[PDB]
RNA sequence: AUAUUUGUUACAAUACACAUUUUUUGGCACCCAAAAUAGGACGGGAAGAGACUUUUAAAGUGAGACGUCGCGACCCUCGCAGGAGUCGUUCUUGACUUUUUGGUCGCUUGAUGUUUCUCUCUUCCCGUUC
C-alpha cells in the first residue's frame, strides 16, 4: 500500500542484517513496497573484517522478508 | 521469456518432481492441476527422501521448487 | 467483628498500593480499626487476589496464622496487633517483608514460631515488642531470622551477620 | 495530609529508604505515597497519608525517632501534594 | 487502529524497541508508518547477548518488532477518550 | 442425486455374507437393522471407528475381517438394550436372552 | 485475471470452479465418495481421517480420524496411536493429503 | 533509483548467471539463469544447480518459490 | 480470585489488568487500554515476567517456588503477531 | 465458504483446543471470532507427557503455562486451571468437539 | 389544578469482509541420557576430604566471557517544592513555551541470569512421604 521511506538512505553505504546470522553491507540502489532492497558492491561482513569478508556481486537484490534492521553508515 | 504461471500451464500432465522445504523430500509424479496459489495435484506420485502413492494434494506453502 | 468472607468482599480493593504490585486490600469496612479479635479466618475469600500487600494495622489479632496459599502476597503490615506467636507453613516461599510494630510477640515466642529457615522474608520490623528489650535480643533475632536483610530498620551488620552465623555454628 | 521529613541518613538507598518509610508510617494510617517525587534524599521526603488525623498522629509520635542512626525531624508540609 | 496512532503520536520522543531477534534499540523515533516499520535517530543498541553499541540512524522492519515502549505521558492522550 | 424414477441394483450383504454363512449374515444384518435407528449419529462413529477400514467400490458395508463387527454389533445391541430398556425401565442385569431376542425380534 | 476486478457473484463461480475443477477437487471427490484420506501435518503427525467438510484455507472437519505419532530420543523409537471421535482441523498445519484407494 | 524487480528484469534479459541464497534452514544455494518472474518474486531458473553449504547435482528448468528466496546475486 | 463475565469479549474488558502470553514464553501484565483488528494491544503500566532456565527445569514434573526475572516497562504497544493468549488478572480501580 | 462460521454455532459446548505449542485446553466455548479467535470460560489447559525415557517437553510451553498464574503450586503433573482464557486464532492447531452433536444439522 | 411514554437524527457497540515477503490459514519439528523397594527416600543449610586453581610446603570449589539491580566510600552535594510559567476566563479550567538525583569508584570474592567446553563421598541440623 504505502512505500517505505528510505529516500534519505539511497546511494549511501548501508549495513543491514539478513536473518539472525547474517550482515550485508552495500550501497543502496532501490527499494519497493515489500522493502525488497537492491544494492551494488555487496560485501558479506564476518568476524574477521578483511579476511572472512567476501564480495557477492555487482548487483544484489534482497527480499524484504529477510530484512530485520537497516542502519546506514554514512551521513 | 516464460513466467511461472505459463510454466505451470505448460507442465500440466507431465512428469514433475516437487521438492518440499523440510526433509529434502521430493514427490515425483504426473501433475494434474494447479490453483492460483500454485496448490498441486499429482497422480501416480512417488515419495523420495522409495514409496508409491496413488494420488496427492500438495499445499502451496510447503513446496520448495518444482521441476520436470 | 470477626473476620468473615462477607467482610472481605465488602473491603475496598480499588486503591492499589503503587510502591509495589497491586491490590492493597484492607479487610472488613476498614482493616485499620477492624477489631479482628480471633485469628485471621476466612482467608480463602480473598483467594490470592494480589508484591501483593495486605494492611491489617490497628486490629486485635493474637496469632499470625490461618492463611490460605497466597502466591502474590509480598507485604504484611500488622501494626497495632496483639500478636503473640506467628508459626505457619502456608506463607513460606511467598512474602518479602513483615512489619510487626507495637505487638505482644515474645523474644522466645517470636524465635520459636519461625523454627528457622534457610531463606525467608527480606524485610522485618519487630519494634515495640517486649522481646527486642531482652538481652542479646538483636543477636538472638539475627540467629533466629537466619537469612535477613533488615532488623528494626537497621540492617544486621555484615560483620554482625558473620558473628551471628559463627554463634549458630 | 503530607508530612515533610528532614535530617535522615543519606547513605541508605532510595527505594530501600522509601520502603522503610512505608513500614514506619503504616501504623498511624494508610500511606498514599511511598516516597517523595523529588528524591533529593538526605532527609527530604514527603509522607503522603489518606487521613489528616493519621498524619497528625505520626507527627506527634515520630518526632526525633531513631531511623538509620539519626533522629528524624517531622513537620507539616507548606503546600498540598499533587495526589491529594 | 489506536495502537498504531499512538506510535504516530510518539514521533520525536525517546522510545524503546524489542525486535523478535532479541535485540533492544532504545533511542529517538524519527519516522513511523502504518506498517509499524519505524526509523530511529541516535540510538543505543543491545545485542541479544548483551553487547551494547551506538549507531546514529536505524531503520527496522515492522514485522520484526515485538514491543515498543513509549513515553508514559502519552497515556492520557486524546486517542483514549 | 436421482431426479428420475429408475430401477437400481445393489447388495445389502457386501462382505459378511461373502465371509460368513447365510443364516448368520442376515442375523448380523438384523442386529444392524435395528441398530442404525438407535445409532442416530454413533453409526458413523462406530462403523468408521476403525479408520483403517474402507468401503469397497462395488459394495456398501465396511469391509473387514469381522471381529470388530462382532464387537460393533455387540456395542450396537447395548445401545438397543438400553434404549428399549430406558423406555420400560429395565435393569441391564435383568435383561435376559429371551428378553434380548424380544428386543431384537419383538 | 486479478481477483479485485471481479464482482460478488464472479468470486462465487470462481470458488465453485476451484473446488469442482482444481487441486482441491482431490478432497472434494474424497468427501462425496466416503473415501478415507491420509493427512500429514507440519507437526509430523499423520491422521487417517474421513472428511465431513473442507474449505478454501484447507481447514476441514473430519469424523473418526485416527492420529499416528512416533517419537525418538537417541534413536529409541516408540509409535503412539490416538483415536478422537470428532476433529476440526485448521488448514495451515497440513502439507500433503492423499486419497486412499 | 533502480527498483529491485526492475533489476531482476535486467537479470532476465541480460542473461547473466545468478547465485541465489535460500533460507538458513534448508542449507542449499541455487544458481542458474533467471528466465522470468512473477509479482511474488518466485522465479524460473534455466540450467540450475543446487550447491550444498561444488559437487552439487544439476537440476534443470525449475520453478523456485519466492517464499524461500533470501538473496539473488550475480 | 476474580470472576470475569461469562460472556465478555476483548472490547467488553477495558482498564482491567491483564496477563498477556507471547510466543517466546514471556508475559506482559498490565492495564489494557486499546486493541486492534489484528489484536495488537496497548498496556499502561506493564511488567514483563520471564522463566529462568533453571526455573524451567524445576517446572518439569516430579510446593514449587519459581524465581521469575521481570522488568518494568510502561505504556507499551504490543504486536498482534507475537501474542498467544490473554488472561485476566484483576478488575479496574 | 468460510468454515469458521461452523465454529460460531458450536457455542456453549465442551471442547479441547489443541494449540501449536502442544498445549491442550479443555473448556466451555464462547463466541468464536471470524479470525478463529476462540474465547473460553472454565478451562483446564495442560501439556502432554512424552514418555520416551522422560524426554524433555516443550520448554516454552512450560514457561507460558506457569506464567498464566493459574498453575497451582501442589500440582504434581503439569497443568493449570483458570477462568476466561482468550486465544488468538493463528495459535490453534486441532479442535476436538464433543461426540454428541450431529454435523448434518450444523454443517449446513 | 391533573418526571414518564412514543417517533426521528447522530455517536459509541456487538453479529455477515482478505490463505501469496509488514501482524489471523504457520520455517513446522529433533539435542540425547537418570529412582524402584518391601528403617527407607527427597529438598534446603553448615563443616571436612578428594580432585581442581594460585605462589615459592601453604591458602578457598569445574572454568572463561555480557549485562542486572545491590554491600563499602578517604567524594560531591542544602537543604519543604511529573509537574511549572503565560494568556483567556471567573473563584480553578483550556491554549502556548522550559525542561532525573543520583554524578562516580572498589567488592579483601555483591548477589545474580545468558552462553561454550569436560567429567563426587562423609557427618550434623530442619521440613515432606510411607
Written in H, E and C, the secondary structure of chain I is: CCCCCCCCCCCCCCCCEEEEEECCCCEEEEEECCCCCCCCCEEEEEEEEECCHHHHHHHCCCCCCCCCEEEEEEEEEECCCCEEEEEECCCCC
Which range marks the domain in which residue I31 is found? 1-93
State whether residue G68 is helix, strand or coil: strand
Instruction: Give chain A's length.
Output: 75
Question: Is domain A1-75 annotated with CATH 2.30.30.100?
Answer: yes
Terminal C-alpha separation, chain B: 18
Can you read off the three cell numbers belonging to residue D84?
Answer: 491529594
Write out chain J residues lying below 8 Å of F43, CB-based.
none
Can you read off the three cell numbers belonging to residue B31?
Answer: 501433475
Q: Please list the helix, strand and coil fractions of chain D in percent, rounded to the nearest 5, in that order.
A: 25, 20, 55
Determine the distance in angstroms separating the CA of J31 from the nearest CA of chain G, rounded to an integer: 16
Q: Are B63 and B19 in contact (CB under 8 A)?
A: yes
- Mark out chain C residues that contact chain D at CB-CB < 8 A: 17-19, 26, 32, 55, 57-58, 77, 79-80, 97, 99, 101-102, 123, 125, 150, 153-154
Q: What are phi and psi of A46, to 5 degrees?
A: -145, -175
Measured CA to C1', what is the nucleotide nearest J50?
K30
Determine the distance in angstroms separating the CA of A71 from the nearest CA of chain E, rounded to an integer: 4
G31 membership: H or E segment, kind and range: helix G25-32
Write out chain H residues lying below 8 Å of B8, CB-based.
63
Tally of CA atoms within 13 A in the half-sphere of I19 that contains its CB: 19
State whether residue B37 is helix, strand or coil: coil
Instruction: Measure CB to CB from residue H73 to each of A19, A22, A57 and give the nearest one.
Output: A57
Cα(I82)–Cα(E60) distance, integer angstroms: 17
Instruction: Give chain C's length.
Output: 169
Q: Are J18 and G41 in contact (CB under 8 A)?
A: no
Can you read off the three cell numbers belonging to residue J24?
Answer: 491442550
CATH architecture assignment, domain E1-81: Roll (2.30)
Domain count, chain J: 1
Q: How was this structure determined?
A: cryo-EM
Q: In what order do the strands lie in the sheet with C123-125?
A: C52-55, C73-77, C97-99, C123-125
Residue C111, CA distances (Å) to C26, C64, C89, C116 in order: 28, 13, 15, 8
Rg (CA), chain C: 16
- Domains in chain A: boundaries: 1-75
Interior angle at CA H11, CA H9 and CA H14, nearest 5: 105
Write out chain G residues lying below 8 Å of B33, CB-based.
21-23, 25
Question: Which contacts (CB < 8 Å, 24+ apart) does range H34-38 have?
Answer: H34/H8, H34/H72, H35/B1, H35/B2, H35/H61, H36/B1, H36/B2, H36/B3, H36/B4, H36/B7, H36/H12, H37/B3, H37/B4, H37/H5, H37/H8, H37/H9, H37/H12, H38/B3, H38/B4, H38/B5, H38/H66
Check F40 against J102: CB less than 8 A apart: yes
| Highest CATH level, class, for D1-84 | alpha beta
CA of C166 to C1' of K49 (A): 22
Among candidate residues G30, G99, G59, G22, the one with its CA nearest the CA of residue B39: G22
Check J99 against F40: CB less than 8 A apart: no
Check A71 against E34: CB less than 8 A apart: no
Q: Are D7 and D41 in contact (CB under 8 A)?
A: no
- Domains in chain E: boundaries: 1-81
Count of Cβ atoms closer than 10 Å to residue E19 Cβ: 19
Determine the distance in angstroms separating the CA of C79 from the nearest CA of chain D, rounded to an integer: 5
Determine the distance in angstroms separating the CA of A60 from the nearest CA of chain H, rounded to an integer: 5
Partner B contacted by G58 (CB < 8 A): yes
Partner G contacted by J108 (CB < 8 A): no
Cα(C59)–Cα(C68) distance, integer angstroms: 19
Name the one residue in this structure whose C-alpha cell is 468470486.
G11
Can you read off the three cell numbers belonging to residue C57?
Answer: 494495622
Check G34 against F55: CB less than 8 A apart: yes
Listed by number, the residues of chain B in 37-66 with a beta carbon closer than 8 Å to a beta carbon of chain H are: 38, 61, 63-66
- Domains in chain G: boundaries: 1-101
Q: Are E16 and I73 in contact (CB under 8 A)?
A: yes
Which range marks the domain in which residue H27 is found? 1-74
Can you read off the three cell numbers belonging to residue J87?
Answer: 486465544
Can you read off the three cell numbers belonging to residue G88?
Answer: 476440526
Q: Which nucleotides of chain K are near protein (any atom < 7 Å from a CB)?
A: 13-35, 44-47, 66-67, 69-73, 76-84, 100-102, 113-115, 126-128
According to DSSP, the β-strands at G94-99 and G37-41 are antiparallel
Q: Are H42 and H65 in contact (CB under 8 A)?
A: yes
Residue E51 burial class via C-beta count within 10 angstroms: exposed 0-12, middle 13-18, buried 19 and up: exposed
Check B63 against H65: CB less than 8 A apart: yes
Interface mutation vs chain I, best among J88, J90, J91, J93, most I CBs within 10 Å: J88
- Mark out chain I residues that contact chain C at CB-CB < 8 A: 1-2, 17, 63, 65, 89-90, 93
Domain count, chain I: 1
- Domains in chain C: boundaries: 1-169
Residue E44, CA distances (Å) to C142, E9, E71 in order: 45, 22, 17
Among candidate residues J16, J27, J79, J81, the one with its CA nearest the CA of residue J49: J79
Residue H57, CA distances (Å) to B21, B50, H28, H64 in order: 17, 19, 11, 16
Measured CA to C1', what is the nucleotide nearest E51?
K66
| Highest CATH level, class, for G1-101 | mainly beta
Can you read off the three cell numbers belonging to residue C158?
Answer: 555484615
Q: Are I51 and E12 in contact (CB under 8 A)?
A: no
F80 membership: H or E segment, kind and range: helix F67-88
CATH number assigned to the domain comprising residue H31: 2.30.30.100
Can you read off the three cell numbers belonging to residue B60?
Answer: 502451496
Partner B contacted by G56 (CB < 8 A): no
Q: What are phi and psi of D20, to 5 degrees?
A: -60, -45
- In CATH, the number for domain B1-68 is 2.30.30.100
Cα(J103)–Cα(J108) distance, integer angstroms: 8
Which residue(s) pair with C33 in the sheet?
none
According to DSSP, the β-strands at D65-67 and E38-46 are unpaired
Determine the distance in angstroms separating the CA of C93 from the nearest CA of chain I, rounded to an integer: 6
Write out chain I residues lying below 8 Å of J70, CB-based.
87
Q: Are I9 and J87 in contact (CB under 8 A)?
A: no
Write out chain F residues lying below 8 Å of G100, CB-based.
54
State whether residue F53 is helix, strand or coil: coil
Q: Are C137 and C105 in contact (CB under 8 A)?
A: no
Amino acid at each position: 500500500v504505502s512505500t517505505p521511506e528510505l529516500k534519505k538512505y539511497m546511494d549511501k553505504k548501508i549495513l543491514l542484517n539478513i536473518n539472525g546470522s547474517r550482515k550485508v553491507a552495500g550501497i543502496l540502489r532501490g527499494y519497493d513496497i515489500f522493502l525488497n532492497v537492491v544494492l551494488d558492491d555487496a560485501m558479506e561482513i564476518n568476524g574477521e573484517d578483511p579476511a572472512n569478508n567476501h564480495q557477492l556481486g555487482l548487483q544484489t537484490v534482497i527480499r524484504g522478508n529477510s530484512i530485520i534492521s537497516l542502519e546506514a553508515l554514512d551521513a | 521469456p516464460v513466467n511461472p504461471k505459463p510454466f505451470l500451464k505448460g507442465l500440466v500432465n507431465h512428469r514433475v518432481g516437487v521438492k518440499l522445504k523440510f526433509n529434502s523430500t521430493e514427490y515425483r509424479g504426473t501433475l494434474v492441476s494447479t490453483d492460483n496459489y500454485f496448490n498441486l495435484q499429482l497422480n501416480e506420485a512417488e515419495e523420495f527422501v522409495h514409496g508409491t502413492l496413488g494420488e496427492i494434494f500438495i499445499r502451496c506453502n510447503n513446496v520448495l521448487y518444482i521441476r520436470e | 467483628m470477626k473476620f468473615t468472607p462477607s467482610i472481605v468482599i465488602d473491603a475496598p480493593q480499588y486503591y492499589v498500593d503503587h510502591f509495589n504490585g497491586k491490590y492493597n486490600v484492607d479487610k472488613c469496612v476498614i482493616l485499620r480499626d477492624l477489631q479482628l479479635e480471633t485469628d485471621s479466618e476466612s482467608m480463602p475469600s480473598s483467594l490470592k487476589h494480589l508484591t501483593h500487600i495486605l494492611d491489617l494495622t490497628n486490629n486485635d489479632l493474637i496469632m499470625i496464622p490461618d492463611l490460605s496459599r497466597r502466591d502474590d502476597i509480598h507485604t504484611l503490615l500488622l501494626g497495632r496487633n496483639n500478636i503473640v506467636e506467628v508459626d505457619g507453613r502456608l506463607l513460606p516461599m511467598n512474602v518479602q517483608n513483615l512489619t510487626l510494630s507495637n505487638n505482644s510477640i515474645r523474644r522466645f515466642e517470636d524465635l520459636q514460631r519461625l523454627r528457622r529457615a534457610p531463606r525467608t522474608l527480606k524485610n522485618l520490623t519487630l519494634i515495640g515488642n517486649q522481646v527486642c528489650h531482652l538481652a542479646n535480643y538483636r543477636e538472638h533475632v539475627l540467629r533466629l531470622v537466619p537469612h535477613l536483610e533488615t532488623l528494626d530498620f537497621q540492617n544486621v551488620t555484615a560483620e554482625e551477620r558473620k558473628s551471628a552465623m559463627s554463634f549458630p555454628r | 495530609n503530607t508530612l515533610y521529613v528532614s535530617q535522615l541518613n543519606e547513605k541508605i538507598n532510595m527505594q530501600r529508604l522509601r520502603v522503610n518509610l512505608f513500614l514506619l508510617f503504616a501504623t498511624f494510617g494508610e500511606v498514599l505515597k511511598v516516597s517523595m517525587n523529588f528524591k533529593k534524599q538526605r532527609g527530604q521526603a514527603f509522607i503522603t497519608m489518606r487521613t489528616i488525623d493519621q498524619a497528625s498522629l505520626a507527627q506527634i509520635s515520630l518526632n526525633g525517632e531513631r531511623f538509620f542512626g539519626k533522629p528524624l525531624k517531622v513537620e507539616f508540609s507548606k503546600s498540598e501534594t499533587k495526589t491529594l | 487502529g489506536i495502537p498504531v496512532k499512538l506510535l504516530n503520536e510518539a514521533q520525536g520522543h525517546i522510545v524503546s524497541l524489542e525486535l523478535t531477534t532479541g535485540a533492544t534499540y532504545r533511542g529517538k523515533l524519527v519516522e513511523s508508518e502504518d506498517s509499524m516499520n519505524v526509523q530511529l535517530r541516535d540510538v543505543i543498541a543491545t545485542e541479544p547477548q548483551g553487547a551494547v553499541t551506538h549507531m546514529d540512524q536505524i531503520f527496522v522492519r515492522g514485522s520484526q518488532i515485538k514491543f515498543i515502549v513509549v513515553p508514559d505521558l502519552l497515556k492520557n492522550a486524546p486517542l483514549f477518550k | 442425486k436421482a431426479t428420475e424414477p429408475q430401477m437400481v441394483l445393489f447388495n445389502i450383504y457386501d462382505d459378511w455374507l461373502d465371509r460368513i454363512s447365510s443364516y448368520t449374515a442376515f442375523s448380523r444384518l438384523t442386529l444392524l437393522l435395528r441398530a442404525l435407528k438407535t445409532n442416530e449419529e454413533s453409526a458413523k462413529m462406530i462403523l468408521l471407528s476403525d479408520p483403517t477400514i474402507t468401503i469397497k467400490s462395488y459394495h456398501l458395508w465396511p469391509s473387514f475381517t469381522d471381529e470388530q463387527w462382532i464387537t460393533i454389533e455387540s456395542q450396537m445391541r447395548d445401545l438397543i438394550l438400553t434404549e428399549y430398556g430406558r423406555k420400560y425401565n429395565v435393569n441391564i442385569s435383568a435383561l435376559t436372552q429371551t428378553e434380548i431376542k424380544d428386543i431384537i425380534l419383538g | 485475471r486479478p481477483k479485485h476486478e471481479l464482482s460478488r457473484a464472479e468470486l462465487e463461480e470462481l470458488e465453485e470452479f476451484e473446488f469442482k475443477h482444481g487441486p482441491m477437487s482431490l478432497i472434494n471427490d474424497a468427501m462425496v465418495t466416503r473415501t478415507p484420506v491420509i493427512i500429514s501435518l507440519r507437526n509430523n503427525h499423520k491422521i487417517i481421517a474421513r472428511v465431513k467438510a473442507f474449505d478454501r484455507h484447507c481447514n476441514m472437519v473430519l469424523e473418526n480420524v485416527k492420529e499416528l505419532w512416533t517419537e525418538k530420543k537417541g534413536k529409541n523409537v516408540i509409535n503412539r496411536e490416538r483415536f478422537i471421535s470428532k476433529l476440526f482441523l485448521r488448514g495451515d498445519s497440513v502439507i500433503v493429503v492423499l486419497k486412499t484407494p | 533509483m533502480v527498483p529491485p524487480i526492475n533489476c531482476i528484469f535486467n537479470f532476465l534479459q541480460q542473461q547473466t548467471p545468478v547465485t541465489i541464497w535460500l533460507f538458513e534452514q534448508i542449507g542449499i544455494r541455487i544458481k542458474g539463469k533467471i528466465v522470468g518472474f512473477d509479482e511474488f518474486m518466485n522465479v524460473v531458473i534455466d540450467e540450475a544447480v543446487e550447491i550444498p553449504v561444488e559437487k552439487g547435482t544439476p537440476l534443470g528448468k525449475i520453478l523456485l518459490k519466492g517464499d524461500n528466496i533470501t538473496l539473488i546475486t550475480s | 480470585k476474580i470472576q470475569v463475565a461469562h460472556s465478555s469479549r476483548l472490547a467488553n474488558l477495558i482498564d482491567y489488568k491483564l496477563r498477556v502470553l507471547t510466543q517466546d514464553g514471556r508475559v506482559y501484565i498490565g492495564q489494557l487500554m486499546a486493541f486492534d483488528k489484528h489484536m495488537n494491544l496497548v498496556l499502561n503500566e506493564c511488567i514483563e515476567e520471564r522463566v529462568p532456565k533453571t526455573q524451567l527445569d524445576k517446572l518439569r514434573p516430579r510446593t514449587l517456588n519459581i524465581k521469575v526475572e521481570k522488568r518494568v516497562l510502561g505504556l507499551t504497544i504490543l504486536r498482534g503477531e507475537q501474542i498467544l493468549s490473554t488472561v485476566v488478572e484483576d478488575k479496574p480501580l | 465458504m468460510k468454515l469458521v462460521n461452523f465454529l460460531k454455532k458450536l457455542r456453549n459446548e465442551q471442547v479441547t483446543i489443541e494449540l501449536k505449542n502442544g498445549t491442550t485446553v479443555w473448556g466451555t466455548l464462547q463466541s468464536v471470532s471470524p479470525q478463529m479467535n476462540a474465547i473460553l470460560t472454565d478451562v483446564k489447559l495442560t501439556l502432554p507427557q512424552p514418555r520416551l525415557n522422560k524426554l524433555n517437553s516443550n520448554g516454552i510451553a512450560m514457561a507460558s503455562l506457569y506464567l498464566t498464574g493459574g498453575q497451582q503450586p501442589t500440582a504434581s503433573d503439569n497443568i493449570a486451571s483458570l477462568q476466561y482464557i482468550n486465544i488468538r486464532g493463528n495459535t490453534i492447531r486441532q479442535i476436538i468437539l464433543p461426540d454428541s452433536l450431529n454435523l448434518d444439522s450444523l454443517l449446513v
